[PDB]
C-alpha cells in the first residue's frame, strides 16, 4: 500500500486494478521447480 | 485391486464431483428465487394483493428480468460443462 | 419457474417466449448430446 | 415450434397445470365499527408542536360512511393502492391528528423541508400509510383572532421521524447566554397562529390526520369490510388470508407457531404455512401444479395420432388429460 | 464543496488551471481536489487495499487457522493481529504457522512453492 | 422526599465477557430448518461488557450510563432486587423521560416530565414480630407534569422475602429506540451459577413496542434496598443492601447467520466478520 | 420581461424565511430539499 | 451527496445491475479461455 | 468492485450475495484447474 500511494501523480495499471478489487494470484510452482523438472527429464532421456 | 476398491471409497471422486456440481447448480437456481431485484418484495402475491395493475407492473418487470438473467446464467454454465464432459467422453471412446 | 401459478405475470411475460424457447432448445440439445455420447462410447461392438 | 408442421420425434410441453375450483375468504370476525367520529368529528384538536397520537384496534374499516359529509381536500396514500383498501387487514393503526396552516399542508410528506417538516413534525423516509387533510375554517377560526394553536419556530437541530418536542426553553441565537429571560438575541420558541375568517386561502386552518400501519407481516386486528367464507381443504382453491391472496391446496399441519407468529415462509421466501384467523389452527399451502408432460408424434404429413407420456406418475382417475385406452 | 467521500488526503504535484476545481481518473472518479480555504491541490486515495486468505484444517479437527496477507512485507503493519509465528513468503505474510526446514509432499497449497499442513503440540 | 446515601465504598469498575450471548428474533415470520442471514443491530460476540453488583460485604451501584443505539441488559438475582429503569436525555424536568417500575403490586410505564433526584431507589422493610417482608419506600421522583403515556398492569404480589444462597434467576433484556418506537425484547432463564454469566445460547423473543417518541441518550437502573432493625441509622446509614448483579453491553450494526431447527427455534448463530473463519462460514 | 439577477458570495441559510413569507409552491428539480444545507452552488440566477 | 435515500436507490440499483452484468460477462470469457487453454495443455501433456 | 468504500450501497447489494459467491466459485475453479494443468503437464516423472 505504501507503493501504490507513492505514485499518485503518475498513472499505473496494477494499482488501479488492485484498488477496484481485482487481484492476481501467484502460481503454485515457481520457474525454478519447472527448470528442475525439465533438467530431470533431459537427464533421464539422455542417460537411460 | 479388488481389496483396494472395497476398502477405500475416495478414488471415484471424478463422478461424485459431476453429480454434486449438477445438484448444487439446481439448488442455487432454487435459492435465487428470494431476491428482490430492486422491487419491494420477492413474492408476486404480495405485490398483486397490495397494488393495482398500474403501478405493480414495474416490480413484476424487474422480477421477470432478474429471473431470466438467472436462467440464462444457468444455461451457459450447463453448456460449458456439457462441452467439457463431451471432450472427456470422446477421450474415453478413443481409449476403448 | 418465473411466476408459476399466476395469470397477470404470464400475460406480462408473453413478450419473452423467444428467450424461453431458445433456453429450452439449448437444454434439449444438451440432453441429446449426452445420450449420443453414451451410445457412442458403449456401443462400439454390435453383436452380444 | 411456431409452425403448422411437426417432425417425427418427442417434445416436452408444459407441466400438468391444474386450474382452481372455488374461492374462499378468511377474515377475523369482528363486529364493532371503530370511531370515525372521534378522529374526524371531534370538537378539539391538538396543536402541531404537540400532536395527538391514538391507537385504533378491533375495526371493520369501511370508510363508506365518510361520504355523507367531511369532504377531504387532500388524501394521499403511500405504500398501498387506494383501491385495495377493502381487501386488506392492518396490524396496528395509529392516527396522528393536528391542525396547521393550509400553505404548509404540502410539508406533510416524506423527504420535505420547511419549519413544520424540521422543527414540529417529521415523517420517516420509509412510510406506509397515508395523509388526509381538510379545511375547517368555520370551526377552528373565529372573528377577532384565535390564538389557541401554537407552533415552534426556533430549534437547534432538525427532528427525528415521529419525535415530539414540547419543551419551552429560551433559545439563544447570538453568543451571550440567555438564562431564562427574553431579550436581545433571546427569543421564545413557540408562537401562536393567527386565524381569522377573512384571511386568504393560504392562511386558513387545515385539520390533518395521518394514519400509520403495517401490512402482511404480523397478526392483524383492523380489517376491511369483506365477508367471510367457509373453509375447504384438499382442493386447489383461491384463498384470501388477512389480505394475502393466492392459489393452492390447504392441508392440515403439524407445526406449532409461537403466539406472535402468523405466517410461515420457505427457503425460496414464499408463503408455506398460515394460521386460520377464525379458528386458531395451522394449515400448509401447496401448489397444485406438478409433473412433466411429453408428446410422441410421427410426422404431421403421415398421421395425427399422438402419444402422451406423463412423468412421475403411476397408472397401476389420475392426473392425466384423458385416460383413453 | 458538497462532495462527500472517504479516503486519505495527500500532498499533490499537479497544477490546476485557474478555472478548475476537481480532478478525475480514467474510471471517472474523483482523484484530486483543490482546498477552498487555502489554494492547494490534494490527492484522494482509498484506504482499502490488499487481499486476505485463510488456511484451515477441518472444523472437526481444530479451530486454529493461519492468515496470509497478500502484497505486504513483515520484515505495526496492515494486519488484523500480529500475534507470533510470523513468516515471510513471496506470496504474502503468513501469520499463525511456524516455519520448518523439512520437505514432504505438501498438503495445502499456499503458493510460490510454499505449502502448509496440520502436524505436531498440535499446530500448523 | 428522596434522600442521599452516604455509606457506599467505591472500587474500580469490573468487566466481563459476553459468551455468544444476545441474539433475538429479527422478525415475526416462522422458519424451520433454515440457515438465514440477517443485517441488524446485535451485540458482538465475545464483547467486553460492564459488571455491576450490589452486596453488603458495601457496594450499591446505580450510575447514569449512556444509551448508544440500544442496550443489552442482563441481571442475575435471587431476591428480585433489580426492579426498574429510567430513560431520558437530561432527567431535570426540562425534557420528557420514560419510567418503567415494578413496585411489587403493578408494572408502571410512564412517559412523563419527571424531576428525578440524585439517588432514586425503592425500599423494603423487615418486621421482627411476624415473618412478613413488605415494600414501604418509593423515592424515585418528586414531581411530574405534562404526563403523556399511561400503563398500569393488573395487581399482583411478588416474592420479595430475603433469600440467600446461590443465584437463581437470569433475566435478559434488549432495548432499542428507532423511529419513535421503543422496542423491548425479554427472556428469562433459571440458572445455578454464583458469580458470572453462564455460557450458553438463548434467543430473545419480542416483548413490547411503545410509541413514545423520545430523544433517549442516557439511562439509569432502579434497585431495591432493605431496611432492618439491625442498623439504627435514620435514612442514609440505616440501609443494608441485598445481593444481585447486572451486566451492561452496547449494540452495533452487524451481520448474523442464524440457524432455525426443525421445530422453529434459533439454536446457533454466527457473528459474521468477527474473525476470518467466521467470514468463511458466512461465504 | 422577467427580471434576472445573479447572486454570489452567499451563506445560503434560508432559515430566516420561516418568520414570514409562507410559500404556496416550492418544487425543486435536480436536488433533494433535505440536502440544501450540505451543498455549494456555482452560479445562482434568480428569475422573478 | 445530492439525493436522499428515497429517490437515490433507483440510480444505485441501475449501477449495481450494470456492474453485475459486466462481471458476469468477464467470468464467461474467462471460462471459455480456460477451457481452450486446458485443451492445449492436454495436447502438450500427450506430446510430452 | 461494485461500490467499494460505501455503506448504503453495500446494504442495497446484500441481495446479490448468491451471484457474487457463484462468480467467486467459478474463478476459484478456474485457478485450481490451471494449477492442476501445470502439475499434470510437468510432473510426469517423479524421481529427480
Ligand atoms: C420491571 C417490570 C417487568 C418487566 C420489564 C417484565 C416481563 C415479564 N416477566 C414476567 C413473569 C415473573 N416475572 C417477574 C419480575 C421480573 N422480570 C424482570 O425483569 C423484573 C424486573 C421482574 C420484577 C422484579 C418475577 C419475580 C416473576 C416470578 C417467576 C419468574 O422468574 O419468571 C411477565 C408475564 C406475567 C403474566 O402474564 O401473568 C412478563 C411480560 N415483567 C415485569 O414485571
Ligand atoms: C438528543 O439529546 C442530545 C443531548 O442533549 C442532543 O445532543 C446535543 O445537541 C446540542 C446542540 O447544540 C449540543 O450542544 C450538545 O453538545 C449535544 N449533546 C450530545 C451528547 O450530543 C441531541 O441534539 C438531541 N437529538 C435531537 C434529534 O434533538
Ligand atoms: C435569494 C438568495 C437565495 C440564493 C440561494 C440559491 C440556492 C440555495 C437555496 C435555497 C432554497 C430555496 C430558498 C427558499 C427555501 C424555502 C424554505 C421554506 O420556507 O419552505
Ligand atoms: C368467531 O371468532 C371466534 C374466535 O374467538 C370463533 O371461536 C368463532 O367460531 C367465530 N364465529 C364463527 C361463526 O365462525
Ligand atoms: C359529524 O358531526 C355532525 C354533527 O355533530 C353530524 O351531523 C355528522 O353526521 C357527523 N358525521 C359523521 C361521519 O359522523
Ligand atoms: C479565509 O479565506 C482566506 C482565503 O482568501 C484564507 O487565506 C484564510 O486563511 C481563511 N481564514 C481561516 C481562519 O481559515
Ligand atoms: C520487502 O521489501 C524489501 C526491500 O526493502 C524487499 O527485499 C522484499 O522483496 C520485500 N518483500 C517481498 C516478499 O518481496
Ligand atoms: C443529594 O446530592 C445532590 C447534589 O450532590 C443535592 O442536589 C441534593 O440536595 C442532595 N439531597 C439530600 C437529601 O441531601
Ligand atoms: C476490557 O475489560 C478490561 C477489564 O479487565 C478493561 O480494563 C478494558 O478497559 C476493557 N477494554 C475496553 C476497550 O473497554
Ligand atoms: C404482622 O404482619 C402484618 C402484615 O403481614 C404487618 O402489617 C404487621 O406489622 C405485623 N403485626 C404487628 C403487630 O406488627
Ligand atoms: C405543559 O404544562 C405546562 C404547565 O403545567 C403548560 O404551561 C404547558 O401548556 C403544557 N404543555 C403541553 C404540550 O401540554
Ligand atoms: C421438537 O419438539 C418436540 C416436542 O413435541 C420434541 O420431542 C423434539 O425433541 C423437538 N426436536 C428437536 C430437534 O429438539
UniProtKB/Swiss-Prot annotation, chain H:
Domain of life: Viruses
Biological role stated in the UniProt entry: Subunit of the fusion protein that is processed upon entry into the host cell. Mediates fusion of the virion and cellular membranes by functioning as a class I viral fusion protein. Contains a viral fusion peptide that is unmasked after S2 cleavage. This cleavage can occur at the cell membrane by host TMPRSS2 or during endocytosis by host CSTL. In either case, this triggers an extensive and irreversible conformational change that leads to fusion of the viral envelope with the cellular cytoplasmic membrane, releasing viral genomic RNA into the host cell cytoplasm.
Identification of the protein by name: Spike protein S2'
Organism: Severe acute respiratory syndrome coronavirus 2
Full-sequence range covered: 982 to 1029 of 1273
Amino acid at each position: 500500500y505504501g507503493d501504490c500511494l507513492g505514485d499518485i501523480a503518475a498513472r499505473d495499471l496494477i494499482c488501479a486494478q488492485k484498488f477496484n478489487g481485482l487481484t492476481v494470484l501467484p502460481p503454485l510452482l515457481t520457474d525454478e521447480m519447472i527448470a528442475q523438472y525439465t533438467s530431470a527429464l533431459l537427464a533421464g532421456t539422455i542417460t537411460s | 485391486i479388488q481389496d483396494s476398491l472395497s476398502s477405500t471409497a475416495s478414488a471415484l471422486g471424478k463422478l461424485q464431483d459431476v453429480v454434486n456440481q449438477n445438484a448444487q447448480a439446481l439448488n442455487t437456481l432454487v435459492k435465487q428465487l428470494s431476491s428482490n431485484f430492486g422491487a419491494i418484495s420477492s413474492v408476486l402475491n404480495d405485490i398483486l394483493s397490495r397494488l393495482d395493475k398500474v403501478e405493480a407492473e414495474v416490480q413484476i418487470d424487474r422480477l421477470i428480468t432478474g429471473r431470466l438473467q438467472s436462467l440464462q446464467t444457468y444455461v451457459t454454465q450447463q453448456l460449458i460443462r456439457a462441452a467439457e464432459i463431451r471432450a472427456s467422453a470422446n477421450l474415453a471412446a478413443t481409449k476403448m | 419457474y418465473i411466476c408459476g401459478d399466476s395469470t397477470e405475470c404470464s400475460n406480462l411475460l408473453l413478450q419473452y417466449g423467444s428467450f424461453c424457447t431458445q433456453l429450452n432448445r439449448a437444454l434439449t440439445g444438451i440432453a441429446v448430446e449426452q445420450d449420443k455420447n453414451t451410445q457412442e462410447v458403449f456401443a462400439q461392438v454390435k453383436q452380444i | 415450434l411456431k409452425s403448422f408442421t411437426v417432425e417425427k420425434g418427442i417434445y416436452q410441453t408444459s407441466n400438468f397445470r391444474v386450474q382452481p375450483t372455488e374461492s374462499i375468504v378468511r377474515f377475523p370476525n369482528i363486529t364493532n365499527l371503530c370511531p370515525f367520529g372521534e378522529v374526524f368529528n371531534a370538537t378539539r384538536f391538538a396543536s402541531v408542536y404537540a400532536w395527538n397520537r391514538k391507537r385504533i384496534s378491533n375495526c371493520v374499516a369501511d370508510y363508506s360512511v365518510l361520504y355523507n359529509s367531511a369532504s377531504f381536500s387532500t388524501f394521499k396514500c403511500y405504500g398501498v393502492s387506494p383501491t385495495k383498501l377493502n381487501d386488506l387487514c392492518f396490524t396496528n393503526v395509529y392516527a396522528d391528528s393536528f391542525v396547521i396552516r393550509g400553505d404548509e399542508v404540502r410539508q406533510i410528506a416524506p423527504g420535505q423541508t420547511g419549519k413544520i417538516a424540521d422543527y414540529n413534525y417529521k415523517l420517516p423516509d420509509d412510510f406506509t400509510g397515508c395523509v388526509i387533510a381538510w379545511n375547517s375554517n368555520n370551526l377552528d377560526s373565529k372573528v377577532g383572532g384565535n390564538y389557541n394553536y401554537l407552533y415552534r419556530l426556533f430549534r437547534k437541530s432538525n427532528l427525528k421521524p415521529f419525535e415530539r418536542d414540547i419543551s419551552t426553553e429560551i433559545y439563544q441565537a447570538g453568543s451571550t447566554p440567555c438564562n431564562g429571560v427574553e431579550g436581545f438575541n433571546c427569543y421564545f420558541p413557540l408562537q401562536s397562529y393567527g386565524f381569522q375568517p377573512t384571511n386568504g386561502v393560504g392562511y386558513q386552518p387545515y385539520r390533518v390526520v395521518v394514519l400509520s400501519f403495517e401490512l402482511l407481516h404480523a397478526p392483524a386486528t383492523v380489517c376491511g369490510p369483506k365477508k367471510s367464507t367457509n373453509l375447504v381443504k384438499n382442493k386447489c382453491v383461491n384463498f384470501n388470508f388477512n389480505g394475502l391472496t393466492g392459489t393452492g391446496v390447504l392441508t392440515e399441519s403439524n407445526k406449532k407457531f409461537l403466539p406472535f407468529q402468523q405466517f410461515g415462509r420457505d427457503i425460496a421466501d414464499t408463503t408455506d404455512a398460515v394460521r386460520d384467523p377464525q379458528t386458531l389452527e395451522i394449515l400448509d399451502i401447496t401448489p397444485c401444479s406438478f409433473g412433466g408432460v411429453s408428446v410422441i408424434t410421427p410426422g404431421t404429413n403421415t398421421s395425427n395420432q399422438v402419444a402422451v407420456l406423463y412423468q412421475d406418475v403411476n397408472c397401476t382417475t389420475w392426473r392425466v388429460y384423458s385416460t383413453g385406452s | 464543496n458538497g462532495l462527500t467521500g472517504t479516503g486519505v488526503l495527500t500532498e499533490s504535484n499537479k497544477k490546476f488551471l485557474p478555472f478548475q476545481q476537481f480532478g478525475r481518473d480514467i474510471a471517472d472518479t474523483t482523484d484530486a481536489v483543490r482546498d477552498p480555504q487555502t489554494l492547494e491541490i490534494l490527492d484522494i486515495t482509498p484506504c482499502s487495499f490488499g487481499g486476505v486468505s485463510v488456511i484451515t484444517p477441518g472444523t472437526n479437527t481444530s479451530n486454529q487457522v493461519a492468515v496470509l496477507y497478500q502484497d505486504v512485507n513483515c520484515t505495526t503493519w496492515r494486519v488484523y493481529s500480529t500475534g507470533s509465528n510470523v513468516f515471510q513468503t513471496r506470496a504474502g505474510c503468513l501469520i499463525g504457522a511456524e516455519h520448518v526446514n523439512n520437505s514432504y509432499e505438501c498438503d495445502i497449497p499456499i503458493g510460490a512453492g510454499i505449502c502448509a499442513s496440520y502436524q505436531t503440540s498440535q499446530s500448523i | 422526599q428522596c434522600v442521599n446515601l452516604t455509606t457506599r465504598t467505591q472500587l474500580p469498575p469490573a468487566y466481563t465477557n459476553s459468551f455468544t450471548r444476545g441474539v433475538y428474533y429479527p422478525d415475526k415470520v416462522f422458519r424451520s430448518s433454515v440457515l438465514h442471514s440477517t443485517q441488524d443491530l446485535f451485540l458482538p460476540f465475545f464483547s467486553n461488557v460492564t459488571w455491576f453488583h450490589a452486596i453488603h460485604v458495601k457496594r450499591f451501584d446505580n450510575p447514569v450510563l449512556p444509551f448508544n443505539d440500544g442496550v443489552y441488559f442482563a441481571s442475575t438475582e435471587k431476591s428480585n432486587i433489580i426492579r426498574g429503569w429510567i430513560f431520558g436525555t437530561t432527567l431535570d424536568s426540562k425534557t420528557q423521560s420514560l419510567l418503567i417500575v415494578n413496585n411489587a403490586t403493578n408494572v408502571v410505564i410512564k412517559v412523563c416530565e419527571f424531576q428525578f433526584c440524585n439517588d432514586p431507589f425503592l425500599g423494603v422493610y423487615y418486621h421482627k414480630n411476624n415473618k412478613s417482608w413488605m415494600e414501604s419506600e418509593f423515592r424515585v421522583y418528586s414531581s411530574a407534569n405534562n404526563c403523556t403515556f399511561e400503563y398500569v398492569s393488573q395487581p399482583f404480589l411478588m416474592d420479595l422475602e430475603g433469600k440467600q444462597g446461590n443465584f437463581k434467576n437470569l433475566r435478559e433484556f434488549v432495548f432499542k429506540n428507532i423511529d419513535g418506537y421503543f422496542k423491548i425484547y425479554s427472556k428469562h432463564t433459571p440458572i445455578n451459577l454464583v458469580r458470572d454469566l453462564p455460557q450458553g445460547f438463548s434467543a430473545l423473543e419480542p416483548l413490547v413496542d411503545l410509541p413514545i417518541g423520545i430523544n433517549i441518550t442516557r439511562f439509569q437502573t432502579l434497585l431495591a434496598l432493605h431496611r432492618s432493625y439491625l442498623t439504627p441509622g435514620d435514612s442514609s446509614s440505616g440501609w443494608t443492601a441485598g445481593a444481585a448483579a447486572y451486566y451492561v453491553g452496547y449494540l452495533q450494526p452487524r451481520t448474523f447467520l442464524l440457524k432455525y431447527n426443525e421445530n422453529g427455534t434459533i439454536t446457533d448463530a454466527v457473528d459474521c466478520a468477527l474473525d476470518p473463519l467466521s467470514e468463511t462460514k458466512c461465504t
